[PDB]
């Protein structure tokens, strides 16, 4: 998160960390054994880290679980990033504390201007690199698809949504991919891509989760 603040310990329980000897992406716990993330964050070996506050130290309260099943959307394109959503089944059920909670899926496709919370352990510099120890949060609105498409012509689909600020300054960055974009207690987006980070006229593009509800529900229930 470029241009954000540090979240209070436990304010973002649904936020997880994908690890392979290092934090590479984020995700969201939607039930005690299923994490929802982005598809481009795919790795054949992934250890999900729930209960995390400070990534670069073990505080004792964490829960490291292995990704037993890793299901990317059938129609995920690596070059357009359409259908950039992945399902992760935890090797075992996790304890649901005040440190590990599940987010609710969208019951509505939120409108432009909806205030959302975007969180992550990704880069904090738009130009340069800086990895945060503690989780970063960012309050960012859903932008009109008209401004979203104008910012990236031909690159936006009905499955994508721009969340952020056109004047830049506050955006998601490298390491936040797969991460949560919670609006009114519902996961409306998943950190996906954007040109650079926190650049003017280049808002962050996220996966519009309200278009995968049936799919997320159907896959989990069947597997």
């Amino acid at each position: 998160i470029v241009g954000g603040y540090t979240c209070q310990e436990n304010s973002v329980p649904y936020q997880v960390s994908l690890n392979s000897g290092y934090h590479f992406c984020g995700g969201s716990l939607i039930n005690d054994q299923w994490v929802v993330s982005a598809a481009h964050c795919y790795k054949s070996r992934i250890q999900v880290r729930l209960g995390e506050h400070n990534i670069n130290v073990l505080e004792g309260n964490e829960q490291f679980v292995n990704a037993a099943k890793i299901i990317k959307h059938p129609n995920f394109d690596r070059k357009t990033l359409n259908n950039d959503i992945m399902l992760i089944k935890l090797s075992s059920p996790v304890k649901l504390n005040a440190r590990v909670a599940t987010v609710a899926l969208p019951s509505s496709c939120a409108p432009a201007g909806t205030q959302c919370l975007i969180s992550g352990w990704g880069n904090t510099l738009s130009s340069g690199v800086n990895e945060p120890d503690l989780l970063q949060c960012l309050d960012a609105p859903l932008l009109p698809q008209a401004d979203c498409e104008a910012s990236y012509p031909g690159k936006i689909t009905d499955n994508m949504v721009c969340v952020g600020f056109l004047e830049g300054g506050k955006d998601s960055c490298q390491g936040d991919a797969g991460g949560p974009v919670v609006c009114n207690g519902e996961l409306q987006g998943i950190v996906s891509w954007g040109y650079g980070c926190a650049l003017p006229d280049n808002p962050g593009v996220y996966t519009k989760v309200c278009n995968y509800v049936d799919w997320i529900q159907d896959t989990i229930a069947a597997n």
Binding site: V129, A177, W193
Partner: protein, 376 residues
């Protein structure tokens, strides 16, 4: 056809490059050096065609050439592909200055401009500050003022019948650049006892890496734009393993054999910025490479350089080189990943160029210059 003029022009260079390299290191002990052995060959081939007898046979020996039949075609070839191109800004210059009171061969100061590209110029050597300034000026105009003060007046007098000035400049743009905001002072091991902090460039690069046991070093190859120019860095496994590496690098083949173990990988390179300005005495250096008759009276036999076939020899031969390595390059400018920048975070193995190293610019199969960095 032209393959038997270039893969033959590459073999000579490797012998001379390795030779020029050891000599400059032996001339500038405990310090950073930079030299362009490649750029000194054309003036020698231009000089081996004025020098007759045992002088010519000494030069041709060192230039690794059979006769001056093929010497002209090798440089007349090299002289038809000598401007700019992609990735780098290379500035190679060379000229001969003969005292104003001399009558040169009119016709061959043309086979000098039409095979070597250069011109043979007369200058008032008796006027040191007027002749020295006039030389620095052609060198300063040929290098865009990058190389000033090539020659000093305490080196001239009208005893001086001829001087060979040589200038080489380099500064390139990486295929994928380093971010300036990512540059910070990081450790560098000047010795097993000393460790200083130098502005170290951090960035991921799709490089050709090689762990070379024969040299007890690591070889990395970072490319500039266009993929024609490449920065060759051979980092010794020992902090002090540099002077030991120089010894192994006395083998003109140690590099070819090291480049066959070179494999493609994606690593996070940590390279210190560096600038090197070396003024080399080619007279001393070349004379220590078996080319002494050129800079010797009555033994040079420069009877073809002149119209009159008269007494001449070289008095001076200077080389000033200036390399410049920074973050400059391609692929936009900051949070730079790919086309649409996915917000994923990929970490690659780290390679810290944190000890004295040898470098070299490979402009397509041929090292145009090299040196060593003991302290950025």
């Amino acid at each position: 056809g032209e393959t038997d003029l270039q893969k033959i022009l590459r073999e000579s260079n490797d012998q001379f490059t390795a030779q020029m390299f050891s000599e400059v290191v032996k001339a500038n002990p405990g310090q950073n050096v930079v030299l362009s052995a490649f750029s000194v060959l054309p003036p020698l081939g231009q000089l081996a065609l004025a020098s007759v007898g045992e002088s010519h046979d000494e030069l041709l020996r060192a230039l690794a050439l059979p006769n001056d039949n093929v010497t002209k075609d090798v440089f007349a070839d090299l002289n038809r592909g000598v401007r700019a191109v992609k990735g780098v800004d290379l500035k190679m210059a060379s000229k001969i200055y003969v005292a104003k009171g001399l009558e040169l061969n009119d016709d061959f100061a043309a086979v000098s401009r039409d095979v070597f590209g250069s011109e043979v110029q007369n200058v008032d050597f008796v006027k040191s500050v007027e002749a020295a300034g006039a030389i620095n000026k052609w060198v300063e105009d040929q290098t865009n003022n990058r190389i000033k003060n090539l020659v000093d007046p305490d080196a001239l007098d009208e005893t001086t019948r001829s001087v060979l000035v040589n200038a080489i400049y380099f500064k390139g743009s990486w295929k994928d650049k380093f971010v300036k905001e990512r540059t910070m002072d990081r450790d560098f091991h000047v010795s097993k006892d000393k460790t200083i902090k130098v502005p170290t460039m951090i960035g991921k690069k799709d490089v050709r890496y090689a762990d070379v046991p024969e040299l007890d070093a690591k070889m990395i190859e970072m490319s500039y734009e266009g993929d024609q120019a490449s920065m060759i860095i051979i980092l010794p496994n020992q902090v002090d393993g540099i002077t030991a590496l120089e010894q192994k690098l006395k083998d003109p083949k140690a590099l070819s054999r090291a480049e066959e173990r070179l494999y493609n990988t994606e690593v996070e390179i940590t390279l210190p910025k560096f600038k090197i300005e070396t003024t080399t005495d080619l007279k001393e250096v070349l004379s220590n490479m078996n080319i002494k008759k050129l800079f010797t009276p009555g033994a040079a036999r420069l009877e073809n350089l002149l119209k009159t076939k008269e007494s001449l020899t070289v008095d001076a031969a200077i080389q000033k080189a200036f390399i410049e390595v920074n973050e400059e390059g391609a692929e936009a400018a900051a949070a730079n990943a790919f086309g649409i920048v996915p917000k994923s975070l990929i970490l690659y193995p780290e390679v810290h160029i944190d000890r004295p190293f040898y470098f070299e610019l490979k402009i397509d199969g041929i090292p145009m210059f090299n040196g060593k960095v003991i302290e950025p």
